[PDB]
Write a protein that binds this ligand. Sequence first.
Ligand SMILES: *[C@@H]1O[C@H](CO)[C@@H](O[C@@H]2O[C@H](CO)[C@@H](O)[C@H](O)[C@H]2NC(C)=O)[C@H](O)[C@H]1NC(C)=O
Ligand SMILES: *[C@@H]1O[C@H](CO)[C@@H](O)[C@H](O)[C@H]1NC(C)=O
Length: 177
Amino acid sequence: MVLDVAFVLEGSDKIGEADFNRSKEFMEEVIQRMDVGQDSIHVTVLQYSYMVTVEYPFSEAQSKGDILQRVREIRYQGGNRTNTGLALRYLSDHSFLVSQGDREQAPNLVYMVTGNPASDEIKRLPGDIQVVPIGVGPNANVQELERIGWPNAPILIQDFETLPREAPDLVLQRCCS
Ligand SMILES: *[C@@H]1O[C@H](CO)[C@@H](O[C@@H]2O[C@H](CO)[C@@H](O)[C@H](O)[C@H]2NC(C)=O)[C@H](O)[C@H]1NC(C)=O
Ligand SMILES: *[C@@H]1O[C@H](CO)[C@@H](O)[C@H](O)[C@H]1NC(C)=O
């Protein structure tokens, strides 16, 4: 199938390295079971806190092996803010502009792993980008996530320790069933 999928991982100080690693584990589980390929599913990975880091761009080779190795090598960046709005803005202003021609009509999906309320202003993405917020732990701002996600309901997960257990299947069921 043809999809553009963005994973957005919060990697602030409030998340911490241990929990960030669990976010990476979650994401690896998803990507491993996705039909990733140059003509099929494309994946981008962002990490964000104060700034946004592009960990794997849409415009590099869309090979599962390459992406997974890069994912394993991602280093927790830390940061004193959770600039979720900035991460979303990057997707609309950069990431989802990569697909061109026929592929421009493919669905755009965003899977975002956050555990804290946004530090900045959140603006809604264009209608052609579907966002599924994954709020992890008790400090996720449910109302904010519901606002970003609409019409998609956010997936609210107990904590980061449990995130890699079942949440990958919830994600795969929404994207790729
Ligand atoms: C999160 O993952 C990173 C990298 O995957 C871990 O960093 C490793 O830490 C061990 C500690 O025994 C070192 O021996 C390695 O050199 C590190 N590897 C890399 C690639 O940096 C880190 O320990 C993990 N952190 C937590 C809190 O689980
Ligand atoms: C917050 O992070 C920014 C960017 O790294 C930095 O300039 C600033 O000094 C930090 N402030 C505090 C109080 O840690």
